[PDB]
Amino acid sequence: ALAPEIVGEEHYQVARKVQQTLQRYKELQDIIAILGMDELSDEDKLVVHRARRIQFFLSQNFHVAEQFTGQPGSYVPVKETVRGFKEILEGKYDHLPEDAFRLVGRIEEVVEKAKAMGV
Amino acid sequence: ALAPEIVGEEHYQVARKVQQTLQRYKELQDIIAILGMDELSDEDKLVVHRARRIQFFLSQNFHVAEQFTGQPGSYVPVKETVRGFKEILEGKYDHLPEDAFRLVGRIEEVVEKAKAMG
Amino acid sequence: ASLRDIKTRINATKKTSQITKAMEMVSTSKLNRAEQNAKSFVPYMEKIQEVVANVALGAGGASHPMLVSRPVKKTGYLVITSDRGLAGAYNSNVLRLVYQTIQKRHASPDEYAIIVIGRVGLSFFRKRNMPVILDITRLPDQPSFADIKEIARKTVGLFADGTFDELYMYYNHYVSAIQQEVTERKLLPLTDLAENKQRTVYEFEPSQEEILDVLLPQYAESLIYGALLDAKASEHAARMTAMKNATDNANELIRTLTLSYNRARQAAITQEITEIVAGANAL
């Protein structure tokens, strides 16, 4: 079903760009494993910076998982998902800590929990 | 078997202290090779001083080696071993040369060997 | 992954680990030498500091001391970096601080200039198209004063020349083998000086306005040299720490790769023996 005529042009573009950044991040894992991020070029540093936040934002809190932890679940519409990932790709939230993207749902909750913690 | 339930609390503590000292001496090898002995701090020098003596005291003169060395062998009870290593760890013999610990039995033979050398 | 691929990865990681360990030990020796070199500089700095504090205090002086009244047409930035990488965040911290500081208070490239020590900082500023006017780009591991005499002389001369009316200098300050502090210091004009005594001068004055003119540039050059020594010590410590961490990571990777290789080897032997027996008893 991932085709521009089925899901829409901007949906397709956002998905493909997310996958491209994640592939580029995967290609660097050995270098980070050995010697970290210090010897990366400026472009690759930005790639890692965006990719870690995208990877964390792909997580979500489930309704069913409320028995393992007290956090209630969330239901995210696909329009909201597309908008949030587009905003992350555009660099809007580069200043937020990467731990604020874990298990939230909508993109506004990232801002809310970053504000709740130290920022 | 190295557990205080069966070997004894004093034995266990002495063994752990010996192992810790030898591990620290093992760690210090690279910095000793690079910068030399003089660049180490005072407590590192003390650790090296204790560790070399412990390492030499772990050697022993065997009965079956007499036919080659001319030196009679020794049988050391575990109580004597524990007491000797405790005394070395406490610094009771920091002033003796390290060669006095080379191939002996009980701790008193270290004193006798040092006296014989001078 | 196949057995050949895993074995090649293991061998490559072993070679890398050996190289990193050698670099760590070399950097340790260099750090010891840099520490003793910095120690050898203390008496001269103390003497000149005492002389300047005794003489300059209590008089109007030349254009160097205080002169906060000088309006700032242009601000000079002196940045000290290394010539090689593999030093952790050593260069990145200083470069980020310099970039943020200049962007926070300068709106045009016309009103500031940069003097850079180190080709990594040189490349940084060239890639960001910034007005670099001076560089040295090649310095020994244990530099002497004569190695930077000319560049320090030019830098202090540019202040009196009227090219720019402010000096800020950025470098890593050596605290320990694990901690390096990025430092900003105001070089010229001399913002303030302390006092230990009032009449502990060496040279009884022939003329104040002549002794100051020769004393002050020497003081500025000495400050630059002291900061350079601190930066060299910081660089060597940073390399030592980074190579230690790299060696540890390589050793852990070797361990995990060896475990995976042994699992693959056992699985292989199982598969061939099972196929052999299945074919044999199929008859």
UniProtKB/TrEMBL annotation, chain B:
Task: Please give the superkingdom of this protein's source.
Answer: Bacteria
Localized where?
Cell membrane
The text of the family note is: Belongs to the ATPase alpha/beta chains family.
Q: What does this protein do?
A: Produces ATP from ADP in the presence of a proton gradient across the membrane. The catalytic sites are hosted primarily by the beta subunits. Produces ATP from ADP in the presence of a sodium ion gradient across the membrane. The beta chain is the catalytic subunit.
Protein name according to UniProt:
ATP synthase subunit beta
**Native species of this protein?**
Bacillus sp. (strain PS3)
**From-to range in the entire protein, with total length:** 353 to 470 of 473
UniProtKB/TrEMBL annotation, chain C:
Q: Which Pfam families match?
A: ATP-synt
The annotated subunit structure for this chain is: F-type ATPases have 2 components, CF(1) - the catalytic core - and CF(0) - the membrane proton channel. CF(1) has five subunits: alpha(3), beta(3), gamma(1), delta(1), epsilon(1). CF(0) has three main subunits: a, b and c.
Please name the GO terms of the biological process aspect recorded for this protein, alphabetically: proton motive force-driven plasma membrane ATP synthesis
Q: What is its main location?
A: membrane
Q: Which UniProt keywords apply?
A: ATP synthesis, Cell membrane, CF(1), Hydrogen ion transport, Ion transport, Membrane, Transport
Membrane topology note: Peripheral membrane protein
**Which superkingdom heads the taxonomic lineage of this protein's source?**
Bacteria
**What organism, scientifically named, is this protein from?**
Bacillus sp. (strain PS3)
HAMAP family membership: ATP_synth_gamma_bact
Q: Where is the signal peptide?
A: none
Q: What is the lineage of its organism?
A: Bacteria, Bacillati, Bacillota, Bacilli, Bacillales
> Any idea what job this protein has?
Produces ATP from ADP in the presence of a proton gradient across the membrane. The gamma chain is believed to be important in regulating ATPase activity and the flow of protons through the CF(0) complex.
From the UniProt record, report the name of the gene that encodes this protein: uncG
GO molecular-function terms, A-Z: ATP binding; proton-transporting ATP synthase activity, rotational mechanism
> Belongs to which family?
Belongs to the ATPase gamma chain family.
The record's Gene Ontology cellular component field reads: plasma membrane; proton-transporting ATP synthase complex
Subcellular location per UniProt equals: Cell membrane
What name does the UniProt record give this protein?
ATP synthase gamma chain
Q: Which CDD domains match?
A: F1-ATPase_gamma
